[PDB]
């Protein structure tokens, strides 16, 4: 990454540590500038909040300056009592929506001079049990937040979560003198669901609203989308059998049920991730992902619920919609139409039919549709390529703004056949450093083959952290392959892991064993797996179930019983735990601990929220009582992953253990 | 231990499965003849009550069943609701109190076919925060229960202990769907102590009375000792300082002070254990033991306060008061007058003088003084020894009982100066299976080092639980050796330690090192150490203060920072934090944990009530922003120490390592 790389407005920005060089398709601005437009060594860093408009927020002690980019102007400042974490700038860029103790806030933006305005409780009933205005579901269908502006900053949506009836695991803070206990609400599969609603705030009248959204309680209510209108706030709404998605219209003014414009369901699970796009200008007509047909497109709906058309078709996948031109009349998205291991930008007529790539490269391609939908800024990179900017006038040529190139691990890319005998799974083999095919080389399988995740894709180097690198320059030869389950090839692809979790993946995994043991070069009895989160659930099934063929593994944060994880995600891979005994018992690896005759390491953060403590605990309890014997470590500070400095210690403790037992 | 020898009158007891063969200075009893005596393979466990009147009880499928074996008579019925733990009888041998659901009840002893009646509460507003007739300060100060019955069963004392101001602990239980935790009120040096108090029942009058022990409230007031008389109940109150110890007598009617008899202090620290023993027939003199002048003796008081003499004096010291002969001119005892490595069962003459050792041959005598102070069955071993069983009659011959003897690792015992070049130190060094001296062998050093703890003493094999013999099967020659600081060497011996907790105990466990540096078979390249709780202290502060000698070590449940070490024992040894920074900071290993180089493995017991978890994973946390690593392994379903079959797993774990890494 060099210098964040964004459009404003007509301009392409990039930093310069004291320099922001906006430039066209030229002129600095230097932090002195700005600090002298300020009220109270390098380029601050800030939120774009109105790429179009070039408005920005910078983060400065004691307070946030709205500053304006294309006129230099200081729009407002505010003031959030020290809370930044959930700040959402309304859509005017006058006022910004913020959690705090538990309630949700609206603090207005105070013009430079004119002094500022005391913030606006929207709620004040909050709690450890009520949770007001933040992310819900378990950040499940597309939920990252909890509040919801309408277009014109006229209304404030917001989530409302009633989690009293969750029983909790608790989270220890183990540094106060005596170690301190939090609750956390997560809910396990088969177990009550919290209950959601959606409150509207009414700036005008401070008045506010409840969807009524309707019995059972624990309907999912996901994808908020307000019409551009302001009068209807949509919403998609799935059933705790995740097979079915009503998108229903609900008025924003009184909270009355309006109509369900559409309905989808699915044989194994439908899963909603985006909000309705409504095209430019209108208010009849928006854009809906789907990925009904196996793949995700991109569908043309009517407020009315009819489908006008499906855009996008084809056996690839939309990964990213941009957006759209001024008038309306062509889409931009990101796809794999070129290649599941690819991303290029595409265009495609509103009507439909074939797709003009515009990012052409084989290889990996990240691109940011200008505001006035014209440009088009380009940062490529593949095996051969490190990275190459490339700003773009969608017609005219296309002047590059940066390329650049590069003893170090052979890395070797192929495919292989999935269990099934038929189905394509691609593979990266990360070489030891030095070599010698006179060799005979020890190799680690490094998985995660989970759904939602894609390791092996063209890019630059590793697609790991590096740590398939760490270790080849170690002596041992790193192996992952994209199991069937994981991301970007299709619901086929994917979903053949349905109430069966880990045993189709294991299945694909072993063919990628059978191929390395048809390599000379690799020492058939010196055979490792790493994996972390759904990678250590098959770390360890994978010991479990084939002791012969991995000597030493290290699972870090690992899924051992599923009965034990979310509700939101569990269910819909695996079904309730009750109408699935045989599935969630088949991976239960609490049950299996007796067969694990390797050396294994379980790594845990012991505050980690994604991944309870207690899966690895109880894995090690289930050992002592099997009489097996695993190798641990813990984390008390972290959470799911071990991210900052301490990622060394993290590095340094998962590769010596493999360098001392493989 | 062959089948619980034992005093029942005058006739001394020992089972055979199916029997209960009575003897004397000779009669069966099957447990059919008893189950014919009952309401509703082998012979029943019991708790004996009194063994004078050969009065016991046996557990069966409810309720509890008192039974006389003098005279094969059913006393009494007892329902306690299905509680054990806390059953204490009344001395009249009819009533038994116990604790359920945080209050103090006493259920009635019902006759044979008579009917039973419903048990009294004492108390009735008890909780987790105020706990009635439970031990209390830790389990410090000889206290082992909370409830005390007078002489007479007329009154019932118990404690009462107010908590609410003691931040707790939490403990987690992994094993439901959900984790669930449960405070633990562990009071960490320097915090604010429980306030205790001593209330007192009145089965007449069902009245009920507190003494009136004043302020401060966090007194600790132990060694409860009831008057012949009844009408006094003494305690021993010590300070938060713990230098200062006041005997005082309280009026049991209404529970106001009455006076002081005798204080004692001490420059380090004052530490009573045992409640004061009036002599036979009397309600004037009683026996106190005092460490005072540098060892623990009995010392004959008068109530008056008034010390009548000292009966036993010398350097050496009693190790257990069995009690006086009927008429009470002898004190009878166990002590290390022959040898700190030895237990003799002695006998003195009131007036004091001489002593006779009833039990002269060289090794460990667990004597057992008959009912009528007549007889005396003794359970003596050696070196040479396996054991060897002998009732006597005190003046006659010594009918002896049972008597034994029996490739293994090659036991020695020798001594060596302390770092101090003058204390004698003792220690037992354990041979490698199949030693050949032409070799060198690696060592294990086990450590404990704390005070109240003796681990050299001249018994059968190993006085470790056998780890050592497990260790040296497997080639590793392993080493201990009691420290200064270390138990029955003298007051003298074990204060040196006093506010420099870890110093000298290293000083002199590293003489230890340079004893076994100066074997020929000794590897000093290949040096390690293992311990558990104290002993995990040391073990972790030996590898970070002589990371060159020690390779290797696995530290179990080990004392980190004595800052989370309980008030009660840290204080005594340590004083408090705020007045001795630095000889708390000179132990506080997480300080040091960047000084770890060797492989070092903690162990711990996630529900452990003794050493907080907390002290191992906050190892582990400093070790990963010191940039060190050690292992570790976790015991989720034990405490502080692995009971049972799961110790099987404990020794594999623990030695395994060694075997890896040393
Ligand atoms: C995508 C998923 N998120 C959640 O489960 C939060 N609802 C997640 O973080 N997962 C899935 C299992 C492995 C783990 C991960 O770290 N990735
Ligand atoms: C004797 C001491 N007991 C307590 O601390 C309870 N008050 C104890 O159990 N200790 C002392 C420290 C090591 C640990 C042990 O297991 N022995």
Same mark, same amino acid.
């Given at each position: 990454?060099?210098?964040?790389?964004?459009?404003?407005?007509? +301009?392409?920005?990039?930093?310069?540590?004291?320099?922001?060089?906006?430039?066209?398709?030229?002129?600095?601005?230097?932090?002195?500038?700005?600090?002298?437009?300020?009220?109270?060594?390098?380029? /601050?860093?800030?939120?774009?909040?109105?790429?179009?408009? %070039?408005?920005?927020?910078?983060?400065?002690?004691?307070?946030?300056?709205?500053?304006?980019?294309?006129?230099?102007?200081?729009?407002?400042?505010?003031?959030?009592?020290?809370?930044?974490?959930?700040?959402?700038?309304? /859509?005017?860029?006058?006022?910004?929506? !913020?959690?705090?103790?538990?309630?949700?806030?609206?603090?207005?933006? %105070?013009?430079?001079?004119? %002094?500022?305005?005391?913030?606006?409780?929207?709620?004040?009933?909050?709690?450890?049990?009520?949770?007001?205005?933040?992310?819900?579901?378990?950040?499940?269908?597309?939920?990252?937040?909890?509040?919801?502006?309408?277009?014109?900053?006229?209304?404030?949506?917001?989530?409302?979560?009633?989690?009293?009836?969750?029983?909790?695991? /608790?989270?220890?803070?183990?540094?106060?003198?005596?170690?301190?206990?939090?609750?956390?609400?997560?809910?396990?599969?088969?177990?009550?669901?919290?209950?959601?609603?959606?409150?509207?705030?009414?700036?005008?009248?401070?008045?506010?609203?409840?969807?009524?959204?309707?019995?059972?309680?624990?309907?999912?209510?996901?994808?908020?989308?307000?019409?551009?209108?302001?009068?209807?706030?949509?919403?998609?709404?799935?059933?705790?059998?995740? +097979?079915?998605?009503?998108?229903?219209?609900?008025?924003?003014?009184?909270?009355?049920?309006?109509?369900?414009?559409?309905?989808?369901?699915?044989?194994?699970?439908?899963?909603?991730?985006?909000?309705?796009?409504?095209? #430019?200008?209108?208010?009849?007509?928006?854009?809906?992902?789907?990925?009904?047909?196996?793949?995700?497109?991109?569908?043309?709906?009517?407020?009315?619920?009819?489908?006008?058309?499906?855009?996008?078709?084809?056996?690839?996948?939309?990964?990213?919609?941009?957006?759209?031109?001024?008038?309306?009349?062509?889409? !931009?998205?990101?796809?794999?139409?070129?290649?599941?291991?690819?991303?290029?930008?595409?265009?495609?007529?509103?009507?439909?039919?074939?797709?003009?790539?515009?990012?052409?490269?084989?290889?990996?391609?990240?691109?940011?549709?200008?505001?006035?939908?014209?440009?088009?800024?380009?940062?490529?990179?593949?095996?051969?390529?490190?990275?190459?900017?490339?700003?773009?006038?969608?017609?005219?040529?296309?002047?590059?703004?940066?390329?650049?190139?590069?003893?170090?691990?052979?890395?070797?890319?192929?495919?292989?056949?999935?269990?099934?005998?038929?189905?394509?799974?691609?593979?990266?083999?990360?070489?030891?450093?030095?070599?010698?095919?006179?060799?005979?080389?020890?190799?680690?399988?490094?998985?995660?083959?989970?759904?939602?995740?894609?390791?092996?894709?063209?890019?630059?180097?590793?697609?790991?952290?590096?740590?398939?690198?760490?270790?080849?320059?170690? %002596?041992?030869?790193?192996?992952?392959?994209?199991?069937?389950?994981?991301?970007?090839?299709?619901?086929?692809?994917?979903?053949?892991?349905?109430?069966?979790?880990?045993?189709?993946?294991?299945?694909?995994?072993?063919?990628?064993?059978?191929?390395?043991?048809?390599?000379?070069?690799?020492?058939?009895?010196?055979?490792?797996?790493?994996?972390?989160? !759904?990678?250590?659930?098959?770390?360890?099934?994978?010991?479990?179930?084939?002791?012969?063929?991995?000597?030493?593994?290290?699972?870090?944060?690992?899924?051992?019983?599923?009965?034990? !994880?979310?509700?939101?995600?569990?269910?819909?891979?695996?079904?309730? #735990?009750?109408?699935? #005994?045989?599935?969630?018992?088949?991976?239960?690896?609490?049950?299996?601990?007796?067969?694990?005759?390797?050396?294994?390491?379980?790594?845990?953060?012991?505050?980690?929220?994604?991944?309870?403590?207690?899966?690895?605990?109880?894995?090690?309890?289930?050992?002592?009582?099997?009489?097996?014997?695993?190798?641990?470590?813990?984390?008390?500070?972290?959470?799911?992953?071990?991210?900052?400095?301490?990622?060394?210690?993290?590095?340094?403790?998962?590769?010596?253990?493999?360098?001392?037992?493989?």
């Amino acid at each position: 990454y060099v210098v964040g790389l964004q459009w404003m407005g007509d +301009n392409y920005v990039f930093i310069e540590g004291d320099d922001l060089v906006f430039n066209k398709a030229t002129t600095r601005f230097s932090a002195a500038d700005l600090n002298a437009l300020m009220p109270e060594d390098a380029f /601050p860093s800030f939120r774009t909040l109105d790429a179009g408009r %070039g408005l920005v927020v910078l983060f400065t002690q004691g307070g946030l300056v709205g500053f304006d980019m294309l006129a230099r102007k200081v729009t407002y400042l505010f003031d959030t009592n020290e809370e930044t974490a959930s700040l959402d700038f309304s /859509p005017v860029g006058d006022r910004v929506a !913020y959690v705090r103790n538990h309630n949700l806030y609206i603090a207005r933006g %105070g013009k430079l001079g004119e %002094g500022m305005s005391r913030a606006i409780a929207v709620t004040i009933d909050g709690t450890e049990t009520l949770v007001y205005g933040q992310a819900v579901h378990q950040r499940e269908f597309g939920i990252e937040k909890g509040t919801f502006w309408s277009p014109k900053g006229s209304c404030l949506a917001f989530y409302r979560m009633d989690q009293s009836m969750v029983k909790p695991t /608790p989270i220890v803070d183990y540094h106060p003198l005596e170690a301190e206990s939090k609750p956390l609400y997560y809910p396990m599969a088969g177990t009550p669901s919290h209950h959601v609603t959606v409150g509207i705030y009414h700036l005008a009248t401070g008045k506010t609203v409840y969807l009524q959204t309707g019995e059972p309680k624990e309907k999912f209510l996901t994808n908020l989308s307000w019409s551009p209108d302001e009068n209807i706030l949509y919403v998609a709404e799935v059933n705790r059998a995740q +097979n079915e998605c009503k998108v229903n219209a609900y008025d924003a003014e009184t909270g009355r049920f309006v109509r369900t414009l559409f309905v989808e369901t699915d044989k194994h699970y439908v899963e909603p991730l985006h909000p309705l796009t409504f095209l #430019p200008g209108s208010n009849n007509q928006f854009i809906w992902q789907s990925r009904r047909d196996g793949w995700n497109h991109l569908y043309l709906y009517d407020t009315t619920g009819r489908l006008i058309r499906q855009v996008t078709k084809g056996e690839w996948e939309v990964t990213n919609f941009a957006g759209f031109d001024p008038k309306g009349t062509r889409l !931009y998205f990101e796809s794999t139409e070129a290649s599941p291991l690819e991303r290029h930008f595409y265009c495609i007529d509103i009507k439909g039919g074939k797709t003009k790539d515009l990012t052409p490269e084989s290889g990996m391609h990240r691109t940011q549709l200008s505001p006035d939908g014209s440009a088009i800024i380009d940062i490529f990179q593949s095996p051969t390529v490190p990275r190459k900017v490339t700003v773009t006038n969608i017609g005219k040529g296309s002047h590059t703004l940066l390329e650049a190139k590069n003893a170090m691990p052979e890395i070797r890319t192929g495919t292989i056949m999935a269990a099934d005998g038929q189905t394509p799974l691609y593979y990266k083999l990360t070489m030891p450093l030095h070599f010698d095919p006179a060799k005979k080389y020890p190799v680690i399988v490094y998985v995660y083959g989970g759904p939602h995740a894609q390791l092996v894709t063209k890019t630059w180097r590793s697609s790991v952290g590096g740590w398939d690198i760490y270790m080849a320059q170690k %002596g041992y030869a790193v192996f992952t392959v994209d199991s069937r389950g994981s991301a970007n090839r299709g619901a086929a692809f994917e979903q053949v892991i349905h109430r069966r979790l880990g045993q189709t993946e294991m299945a694909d995994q072993m063919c990628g064993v059978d191929f390395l043991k048809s390599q000379s070069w690799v020492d058939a009895d010196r055979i490792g797996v790493h994996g972390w989160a !759904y990678g250590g659930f098959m770390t360890t099934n994978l010991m479990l179930t084939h002791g012969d063929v991995f000597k030493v593994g290290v699972a870090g944060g690992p899924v051992i019983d599923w009965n034990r !994880y979310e509700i939101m995600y569990g269910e819909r891979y695996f079904d309730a #735990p009750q109408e699935n #005994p045989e599935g969630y018992d088949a991976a239960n690896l609490l049950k299996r601990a007796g067969d694990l005759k390797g050396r294994l390491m379980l790594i845990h953060g012991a505050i980690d929220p994604v991944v309870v403590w207690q899966h690895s605990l109880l894995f090690l309890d289930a050992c002592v009582k099997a009489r097996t014997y695993p190798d641990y470590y813990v984390y008390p500070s972290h959470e799911h992953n071990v991210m900052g400095p301490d990622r060394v210690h993290l590095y340094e403790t998962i590769t010596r253990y493999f360098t001392d037992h493989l």
